[PDB]
Design a protein around this ligand. Structure first.
Ligand SMILES: Nc1ncnc2c1ncn2[C@@H]1O[C@H](COP(=O)(O)OP(=O)(O)OP(=O)(O)O)[C@@H](O)[C@H]1O
Ligand SMILES: Nc1ncnc2c1ncn2[C@@H]1O[C@H](COP(=O)(O)OP(=O)(O)O)[C@@H](O)[C@H]1O
Ligand SMILES: Nc1ncnc2c1ncn2[C@@H]1O[C@H](COP(=O)(O)OP(=O)(O)O)[C@@H](O)[C@H]1O
Ligand SMILES: Nc1ncnc2c1ncn2[C@@H]1O[C@H](COP(=O)(O)OP(=O)(O)O)[C@@H](O)[C@H]1O
Ligand SMILES: [Mg+2]
Ligand SMILES: [Mg+2]
Lengths: 1544, 281, 97
């Protein structure tokens, strides 16, 4: 327990000390200590490696003492390194925004400054890189992402300050002082531009170009504030001529100059500066107009103090404190943080109210809480206010993983740096986390309040707060802001104490008209006022008139996207007119171009490009009428993107897809593809919404390929099923102990793209989320899908979204996504009408004609078959009308078009393979065109029938057959009454009845009612053929039907005809999760790293692994209607693989197929399957055998049974009838409506026949009365033991007598129906009937012996005790015989079970559960019992009580053990090797020589099945039994249920 | 020592603080203990077998939810904190919470400003009972808003009055106070145009120079033809004494609402009372 | 054309704001006006004694809370609610006055 820790510590410390070759210069003494440690480590490696034996090294003295000394040394040096990192973070606090490994990277790479250039983006607001000279010895300045640079007035020399922290601090200080000096110069110039009647455009543009985008806006604000203050000071006399009009006119003329400037072409940086200046001066004009209208003549009037005012004092020695920003009574000093070129918001009334409220909160030294619906400007307004004060604002997208420690360290970083923390979705945290974080917030605010006191002096002790058990310095510039959408799903409730720490503000209705007007005016739109007054009411009326859809969003983000697109479209149209003028003539006048420009047409084009793609069919005319009314007389026609259209054509031809233009076949699909392309061009977050199989996947794949072939940029798509894995595996985990971050799947992909080791940034990267969307996981992408384009992790790491990456979602609905997600994504709606059925038929036929089925005569056969079946796959054809009619029938599951179509296509592929097999079998006489035509037509009819009605009852199948017969022209069977579903198609091309494949067999006497014995019946031969057809193609299939209908029996019978397939049983339950599938893969398959990637394939080469799921619809749906295991299977089927979360690696499945079984979804505890899952799995409905089929199946078993006694051979026909009638009656009498366990199926009848056969095996002869007695006894043990009420059991007795007398008239009633019907093999060797009194005496004697040898609790014998012990003895004498005794506590269930187990030689095992009992203890006990009963051949009665269960994992493991006899993941690791060793020893003891682990594990499973008997005892709860029926299905279909109840 | 419940470190801190205080005699407060219903049981068992210092006190602040253990409720004395029953009770609580030295300061008008603040707070908090009509939704107009308004009044009065004993009512920054209360303090919670209009209603009606006249009416036609009269006093004790002599006949007309607004509610509660008197029979 | 002269109950419609938008659109299209420059005027009259012009739409079931309407003028009342017999919504050009 010491060697591994020391080894790991030495490895990572050696990595740290070796990667950082310069770390020794700052850490000398510990460098020498680590050199000594490394010498010691080399000594150990030279000593222990010589002798590779544990015994050879544990005999050497001085090893453990030296190891303990080394452990202490490693701990001490690690603590010293941690303290050093803390101390170096104390200086230059920006290092609190980088990780420890990153901090060490900067520490050791101080000599080379090239590696440090990637860390400034996370330590500074807008500093992306630092400018250095050719020597890389002095820091000349800083640069931003946009390329704007600030040249330091005095460059920082790294040579004079070699230490990293010192010159970094000098760089930051020089940044601030240089920004202050440049601001002073810009203010000096803009003052000259101020107080002027006219402004020269050239000088104004020169000044704009000279200074940074931040500084020009700041200087304009300062100059305007000074002008207004001077005017108010002059007017303070009262009743005087106003020079405030002069200030207003100065604003107006400057706005005119700026508006003229933006009309003409400008450099992008200058254009952004002009836009910011236009916005700011529009706000200034509005404020000045408000002041003039209000007749404000005093500078102390609140109409002027309520505004943001800027005061510049050149007389201040400190240039940092030279600028003051004041709002109401709140004063701030400009932080002078370089912000680069941010996007300025429009200062609307709401923004002003937000500024006032947040500044009031800041003056009170408490946080701000803007709340409201999504897209109201809550986060952006906070960022805009932070940038207005020159503050460094960091946005943290918060979720429930932001625990106390993560929030504490974020607060520590904010305190040290002095930055603003905008915590978006703060309510996504847990309520207990909110309460815990409230204490830290209160401590920080108290420290700030103490700082604000005038009694404090900066020369005294600095203000510190207790954060994470540490004293942390709190800067006065810190602020905490939380933006939350109250009411949204996935949000928690804030505690009152936390709420009192923030000033709340309702941001619900943004001033949309003002934003539209200002944005359009800044882009150069003439008549922006009318455009805004038309486009904002248009959005309001679109929200009102249009239908309510979950993917509809007509808020600010929609208008914002529309306005940005309108500006881009205007620029593109101007460029197009420019090139047209260049190619035709030489006269270009940009003013003329702006004058005659159809701005309304541009707005219509923007609206159509952004709003139209998300509209449903019924809402398109409404929106177009709204456009025609709001913008009358103007029309827009979408441009024909031809250059992309030929590429789409080529890709569709290469991908066997149908292409169309406009109103042709597939035209709507191409329109949707073009809309998706436009949304990609305009949005970095996209979503493709529509019902399953609407062509979304093909749309985006074809778009990616066409873009690759058109632009030349290679497109890489990463497809992730977000709900197929846990959110921890999707985003990442933070270790609560070691604070170590493990990346998730999306995080790993994004980080790999950002690093771009293999040129990822040069490729078009599309991260598609193909799965369900709920607020639990998708809200973590909010900051990703916002203007922030940033992924924030709880460990403080922030990853910026590269411009070449698009985040896409492919979903079937958005009924669980909140508006927060809907508003942050461009929606493309794919209706089912987009993908027509003709398109699917064309794709299928093209694939059939092009792709061979074997891997060419096979291709020729496929082409001939496609030519033959072409006439039936047309619009208004046979298949289309059949599908339309089948959609009107009743099916056991929801019917989707692609499920039936894929079933039909697979059956047609099987037909082609049948023709190929016929040709191979007859080399001399290959199948001719006429025989092929007849066979293909008849098989097409047959496959249509079995694919469009295979999941329906008999009457639906007959109805579909009759409809097909009415509409088809294919020759059909001519029977007047036999339905078409009763025929098959022979390879000769003729209809043949299925009854010819159903021969009356004679089962062997010793094989009566055996588990693998099937009596051939019409449904058996039909379902067997259908399952063989579906399995031969490896197409996943689902069998639906009532429990015990024969789904497993049919599937095993069909698989017996496929020797190359090995079946593995998985039993799903309510708490089944994909880890069960992963354990099955680990046990039965292996991963290998082929050159194409990781491939998971079965260990047995040449065999296909069929994973058979027993109850596929049992797994619980979350509160958002998603089953994780179902999504996992859908991913493995549709994508042919999954993701290994150990290293986030795509694993491709090979030679693995899935088969599911389930009860109808209407049954209790069963959920309907997802439509995206049912699309790929054909569903076959296996119903209960009818009276004729049951009579045939059990009649055969009875004849085989009664062949034992010739004198009874004539009673097979009546007995079977007595079997059939009573079973029917009970099935009608007792239903699941009364009690959950009242389920009767052919399984009871098999048990009936099997029990009577066991009773009849030893007897040499027996009269009819004894046979009837055995029949009645087995009926009692089958149909009466589970009954709850007394009247039900009385009904069972009376009708057993009635049925027996009806079917056996001439019998002795008393001799066969003596009411105490008791059978036992205790008194005699055979299972003959026993008398009650002799049985009581024998039980009394055995109980005396039991008291002497075992538990000595005296018992009182009554009749019920004798009946119960007889039943338990019956169950313990059967293979895999498990019990479920349901009754009141203290009724003797455990005592009777132990007594009967002792009589039968079973060893009683009970788990000793205590308070500290966990799942691991249960797993260990399970391993013990399995080893004892499977390796030692010891019969064990495992007695378990319902109170012994502490978790659902108990029920999962018990369910798997009851159903299969083994737990796939129970023995893993050294335990599996020990189990294999003991199993080999046990097999050698038995006399079987087994070599491989697979067959040995099979022998172990057989031993466990034969030996272990599980007795489950539980109290009779009404809802408890219903819950157990779903949590553990095997407790009700693998266990014999005995209702002891209370004592009568 | 105040500790917020919810984290493991929180539980460790709570245990350490209680163990220290039961011997030293200090006080321990634990906040939001309803978020850890399980831990409250072990806390109750720990408290039961304990003989702490004479001056030791343990306060557990919680929300009224059924997850709190019954045994813990029986083990301690319960105090329910809720909106005051009426305008008079609300104003009395407001005047008791604010220190006397705060109201009695350099300007004599500060007392009347605080009285107006208390009346305003009482009216808006009492209109919350008639949720559909008094407002549009259950806004959380609470004690923090009152503190913020008091701080704003203090700051702006001190700014306007540079320590002068008396200032004219027209010189009081009425516009600043009205705007800050309608946009930042009380208007921050308001997310409706009509609720904002009603808040502006109350602020313009109450906060003005006319509030310093002897004929000022706080409310009109409360019952019949009489109306609530603005007290003529200039000291805090006189305002409190006026609040004490309120008629104890409060009607929704005191709030500006119609008198029948309570008619349904006062009916239901009455019936509810009967039900409770029948449940305990 | 008959659908214009019917009186609907706004509370009995699944989406009454869609009805308001539809009436606004009908008035805008009939007079060839722009959709965004239309404002709404309300005239309360008796259901039987009323006339609807090209811009007036009839609405029933509106209840005035705490006030009574006489001659299209509102007065405070002590009644909980007063049933407005018929309401004429008439779309007109915005005057900005
Ligand atoms: N342009 C096309 N021409 C012909 N067939 C097409 C075309 N586009 C798609 N298909 C076919 O129609 C079906 C559409 O499946 P696709 O995965 O594209 O739909 P989807 O809506 O993304 O499905 P899901 O919602 O299940 O993920 C497939 O059989 C596909 O091969
Ligand atoms: N006053 C404004 N001027 C310009 N753009 C604005 C304004 N208010 C909001 N926006 C834009 O609208 C969107 C609002 O985003 P965000 O502030 O995150 O919304 P919220 O916080 O309400 O969810 C962004 O695109 C933002 O730039
Ligand atoms: N033709 C048949 N031959 C033999 N047994 C049959 C036949 N039809 C139905 N059964 C009986 O029906 C039951 C089906 O059990 P099982 O395969 O587990 O059903 P399911 O998969 O529907 O749960 C068994 O008892 C089986 O013997
Ligand atoms: N038939 C009986 N006569 C007398 N005592 C009995 C009888 N059955 C159970 N007990 C007593 O009940 C206790 C055992 O109950 P147990 O079998 O564990 O109950 P459960 O039915 O809940 O499993 C012992 O005290 C035992 O002597
Ligand atoms: Mg936000
Ligand atoms: Mg798809």
């Amino acid at each position: 327990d010491v060697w591994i820790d020391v080894q790991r510590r030495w490895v990572y410390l050696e990595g740290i000390f070796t990667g950082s070759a310069d770390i020794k210069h700052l850490l000398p003494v510990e460098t020498q200590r680590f050199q000594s440690i490394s010498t010691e480590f080399l000594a150990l490696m030279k000593k222990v490696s010589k002798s590779p034996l544990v015994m050879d090294v544990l005999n050497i003295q001085g090893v453990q003492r030296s190891l303990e000394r080394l452990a202490d040394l490693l701990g001490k040096i690690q603590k010293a390194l941690g303290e050093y990192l803390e101390r170096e973070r104390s200086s230059f606090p920006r290092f609190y925004f980088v990780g420890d490994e990153d901090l060490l990277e900067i520490i050791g790479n101080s000599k080379n400054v090239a590696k440090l250039q990637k860390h400034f983006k996370k330590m500074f607001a807008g500093v992306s890189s630092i400018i250095l000279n050719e020597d890389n010895s002095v820091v000349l300045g800083i640069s931003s992402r946009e390329g704007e640079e600030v040249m330091f007035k005095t460059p920082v020399s790294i040579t004079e300050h070699p230490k990293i922290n010192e010159w970094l601090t000098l760089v930051e200080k020089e940044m601030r002082v240089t920004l202050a000096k440049l601001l002073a110069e810009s203010v000096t110039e803009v003052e000259i531009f101020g107080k002027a009647t006219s402004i020269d455009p050239n000088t104004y543009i020169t000044w704009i170009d000279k200074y940074q985008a931040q500084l020009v806006v700041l200087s304009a604000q300062i100059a305007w504030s000074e002008n207004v203050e001077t005017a108010l000071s002059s007017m303070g006399g009262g009743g005087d001529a106003a020079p405030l009009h002069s200030v207003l006119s100065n604003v107006e003329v400057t706005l005119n100059v700026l508006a003229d400037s933006v009309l003409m072409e400008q450099p992008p940086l200058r254009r952004r500066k002009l836009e910011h200046l236009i916005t700011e001066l529009v706000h200034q004009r509005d404020v000045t107009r408000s002041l003039i209208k209000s007749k404000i003549d005093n500078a102390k009037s609140f109409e002027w103090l309520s505004q943001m005012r800027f005061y510049f004092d050149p007389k201040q020695t400190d240039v940092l404190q030279q600028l003051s920003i004041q709002m109401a009574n709140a004063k701030f000093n400009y932080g002078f943080e370089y912000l680069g070129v941010q996007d300025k918001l429009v200062q609307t009334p709401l923004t002003d109210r937000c500024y006032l409220t947040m500044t009031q909160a800041l003056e009170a030294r408490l946080g701000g809480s803007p709340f409201g619906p999504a897209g109201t400007g809550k986060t952006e307004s906070v960022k805009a206010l932070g940038h207005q004060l020159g503050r460094f604002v960091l946005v943290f997208n918060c979720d429930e993983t932001f625990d106390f420690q993560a929030m504490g360290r974020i607060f520590v970083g904010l305190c040290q740096v002095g930055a603003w923390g905008c915590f978006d979705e703060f309510n996504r945290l847990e309520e207990r986390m909110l309460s815990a974080v409230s204490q830290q917030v209160q401590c920080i605010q108290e420290a700030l309040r103490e700082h604000s006191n005038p009694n404090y002096d900066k020369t005294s002790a600095p203000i510190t707060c207790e954060l994470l058990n540490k004293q942390v310095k709190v800067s006065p510039d810190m602020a905490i802001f939380i933006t939350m959408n109250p009411g949204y799903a996935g949000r928690s409730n804030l505690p009152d104490n936390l709420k009192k720490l923030f000033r709340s503000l309702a941001m619900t209705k943004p001033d949309r008209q003002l934003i539209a007007q200002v944005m359009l005016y800044s882009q150069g739109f003439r008549t922006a006022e009318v455009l805004a007054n038309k486009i904002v009411p248009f959005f309001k009326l679109c929200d009102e008139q249009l239908s309510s859809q979950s993917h509809y969003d007509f808020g600010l983000r929609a208008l914002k996207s529309v306005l940005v697109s309108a500006g881009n479209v205007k620029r593109e149209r101007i460029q197009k007119i420019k090139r047209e003028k260049e190619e035709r003539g030489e006269a270009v006048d940009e003013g003329e171009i702006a004058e005659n420009l159809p701005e309304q047409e541009i707005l219509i084009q923007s609206v159509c490009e952004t709003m139209v793609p998300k509209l449903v069919a019924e809402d398109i005319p409404l929106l177009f009428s709204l456009l025609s009314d709001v913008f009358p007389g103007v029309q827009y026609h979408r441009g024909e993107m031809t250059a992309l259209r030929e590429e789409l054509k080529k890709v569709c031809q290469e991908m066997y897809l149908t292409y169309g233009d406009g109103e042709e076949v597939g035209g709507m699909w191409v329109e949707k593809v073009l809309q998706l392309y436009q949304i990609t061009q305009i949005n970095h977050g996209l979503m493709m919404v529509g019902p399953s199989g609407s062509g979304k996947s093909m749309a985006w794949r074809v778009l990616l390929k066409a873009l690759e072939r058109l632009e030349g940029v290679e497109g890489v798509a990463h497809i992730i099923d977000p709900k197929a894995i846990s959110k921890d595996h999707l985003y990442g985990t933070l270790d609560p102990n070691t604070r170590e971050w493990t990346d998730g799947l999306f995080t790993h992909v994004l980080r790999k793209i950002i690093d771009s080791v293999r040129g990822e940034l040069q490729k078009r990267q599309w991260i598609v989320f193909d799965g369900d969307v709920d607020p639990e996981w998708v809200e973590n992408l909010n900051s990703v899908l916002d203007d922030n384009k940033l992924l924030t992790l709880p460990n403080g790491e922030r990853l910026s979204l590269p411009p070449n990456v698009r985040i896409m979602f492919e979903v079937q609905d958005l009924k669980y996504a909140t508006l927060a997600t809907v508003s942050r994504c461009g929606m493309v709606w794919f209706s089912e009408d987009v993908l027509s059925t003709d398109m699917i038929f064309n794709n299928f036929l093209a694939r059939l004609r092009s792709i061979p089925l074997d891997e060419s005569p096979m291709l020729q056969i496929q082409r001939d078959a496609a030519t033959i079946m072409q006439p039936y796959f047309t619009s208004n054809g046979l298949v289309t009308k059949a599908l339309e009619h089948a959609f009107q029938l009743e099916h056991i599951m929801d019917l989707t078009r692609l499920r039936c179509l894929g079933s039909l296509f697979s059956m047609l592929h099987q037909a082609c393979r049948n023709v190929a097999q016929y040709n191979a079998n007859h080399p001399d006489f290959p199948m001719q065109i006429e025989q092929l035509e007849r066979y293909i037509q008849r098989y097409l009819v047959y496959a249509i029938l079995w694919s469009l009605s295979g999941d329906s009852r008999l009457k639906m199948r007959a109805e579909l057959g009759e409809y097909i017969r009415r509409i088809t022209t294919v020759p059909l069977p001519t029977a007047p009454n036999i339905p078409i579903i009763d025929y098959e198609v022979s390879i000769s091309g003729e209809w043949s009845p299925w009854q010819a494949k159903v021969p009356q067999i004679e089962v062997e006497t010793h094989k009566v009612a055996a588990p693998d014995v099937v009596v051939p019946t019409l449904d058996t031969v039909r379902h067997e053929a259908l399952l063989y057809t579906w399995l031969a193609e490896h197409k996943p299939l689902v069998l639906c039907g009532p429990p015990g209908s024969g789904k497993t029996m049919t599937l095993f019978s069909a698989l017996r005809a496929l020797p190359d397939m090995e079946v593995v049983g998985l039993n799903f339950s309510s708490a089944t999760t994909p880890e069960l599938l992963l354990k099955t893969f680990d046990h039965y398959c292996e991963y290998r790293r082929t050159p194409n990637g990781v491939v998971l394939a079965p260990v047995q080469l040449g065999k296909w692994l069929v994973l058979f799921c027993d109850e596929i619809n049992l797994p619980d749906m979350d509160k958002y209607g998603t089953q994780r295991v179902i999504s996992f299977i859908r991913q493995m089927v549709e994508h042919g693989g999954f993701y290994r979360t150990s290293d986030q690696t795509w694993v491709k499945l090979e030679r693995i197929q899935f088969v599911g079984a389930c009860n109808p979804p209407t049954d209790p505890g069963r959920k309907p399957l997802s439509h995206r899952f049912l699309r790929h799995v054909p569903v076959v409905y296996v119903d209960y055998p009818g009276p004729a089929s049951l009579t045939q199946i059990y009649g055969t078993f009875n004849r085989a049974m009664l062949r034992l006694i010739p004198s009874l051979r004539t009673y097979a026909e009546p007995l079977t009838a007595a079997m059939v009638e009573f079973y029917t009656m009970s099935q009608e009498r007792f239903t699941q409506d009364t009690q959950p366990h009242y389920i009767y199926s052919p399984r009871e009848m098999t048990r009936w026949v099997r029990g009577i056969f066991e009773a009849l095996r030893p007897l040499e002869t027996l009269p009819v009365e004894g046979l009837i007695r055995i029949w009645a006894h087995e009926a009692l043990r089958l149909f009466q033991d589970r009954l709850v009420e007394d009247e039900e059991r009385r009904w069972t007795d009376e009708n057993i007598d009635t049925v027996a007398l009806k079917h056996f008239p001439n019998i002795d009633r008393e001799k066969a129906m003596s009411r105490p019907i008791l059978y036992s093999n205790w008194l005699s060797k055979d299972y003959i009937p026993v008398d009650q009194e002799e049985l009581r005496d024998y039980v009394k004697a055995r109980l005396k012996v039991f008291y002497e040898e075992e538990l000595d609790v005296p018992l009182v014998l009554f009749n019920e005790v004798l009946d119960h012990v007889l039943r338990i003895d019956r169950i313990f004498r059967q293979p895999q015989g498990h019990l479920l005794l349901i009754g009141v506590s203290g009724a003797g269930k455990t005592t009777l079970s132990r007594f009967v187990a002792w009589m039968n030689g079973l060893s009683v095992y009970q788990i000793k559960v205590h308070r500290k009992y966990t799942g691991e203890d249960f797993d260990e006990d399970l391993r013990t019992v399995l080893r004892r009963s499977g390796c030692k051949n010891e019969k064990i009665a495992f007695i378990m009580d319902e109170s012994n269960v502490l978790d659902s994992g108990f029920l999962e493991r018990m369910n798997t053990l009851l159903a299969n006899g083994e737990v796939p993941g129970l023995f893993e690791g050294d335990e599996y090797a020990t189990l294999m060793t003991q199993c080999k020893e046990g097999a050698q003891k038995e006399g079987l020589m087994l070599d491989s682990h697979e067959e040995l594990y099979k022998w172990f499973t057989s031993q466990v099945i034969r030996n272990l008997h599980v007795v489950f005892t539980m109290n009779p709860s009404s809802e408890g039994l219903k819950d157990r029926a779903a949590t553990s299905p095997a407790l009700f279909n693998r266990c014999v249920l005995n209702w002891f109840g209370d004592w009568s | 020592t105040s500790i917020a419940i919810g984290s493991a470190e929180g539980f460790n801190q709570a245990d350490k603080a209680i163990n220290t205080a039961v011997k030293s005699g200090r006080w321990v407060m634990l906040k939001n203990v309803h978020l850890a219903p399980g831990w409250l049981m072990q806390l109750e068992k720990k408290l039961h077998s304990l003989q702490p210092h004479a001056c030791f006190r343990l306060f557990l602040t919680m929300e009224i939810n059924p997850k709190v253990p019954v045994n813990l409720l029986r083990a301690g004395r319960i105090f329910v904190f809720e909106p005051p029953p009426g305008v008079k009770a609300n104003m009395l609580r407001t005047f008791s919470s604010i220190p006397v030295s705060r109201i009695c300061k350099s300007p004599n008008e500060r007392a009347r400003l605080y009285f107006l603040l208390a009346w305003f707070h009482a009216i808006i908090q009492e209109r919350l009972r008639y949720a559909p009509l008094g407002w549009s939704k259950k806004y959380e107009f609470g004690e923090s808003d009152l503190r913020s308004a008091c701080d704003t009044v203090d700051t702006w009065l001190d700014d306007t009055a540079k320590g002068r004993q008396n200032i004219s009512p027209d010189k009081i920054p009425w516009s600043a106070l009205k705007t800050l209360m309608a946009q930042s303090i009380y208007g921050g919670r308001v997310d409706n145009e009509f609720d904002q209009r009603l808040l502006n209603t109350f602020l313009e009606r109450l906060f003005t120079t006319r509030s310093f006249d002897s004929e000022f009416k706080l409310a009109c036609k409360v019952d019949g033809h009489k109306d609530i009269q603005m007290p003529d006093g200039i000291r805090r004790e006189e305002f409190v004494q006026w609040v004490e002599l309120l008629p104890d006949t409060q009607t929704p007309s005191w709030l500006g609402l119609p008198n029948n607004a309570e008619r349904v509610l006062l009916t239901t509660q009455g019936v509810d009372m009967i039900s409770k008197m029948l449940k305990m029979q | 054309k008959e659908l214009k002269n019917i009186h609907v109950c706004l509370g009995g419609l699944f989406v009454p704001e869609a009805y308001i938008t539809a009436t606004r659109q009908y008035v805008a299209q009939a007079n060839s006006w722009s959709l965004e420059e239309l404002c709404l005027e309300v005239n309360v009259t008796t259901s039987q004694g009323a006339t609807l012009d090209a811009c007036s739409f009839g609405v029933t079931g509106l209840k005035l809370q705490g006030a009574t309407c006489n001659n299209n003028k509102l007065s405070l009342s002590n009644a909980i609610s007063t049933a407005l017999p018929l309401t004429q919504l008439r779309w007109v050009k915005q005057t900005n006055t």
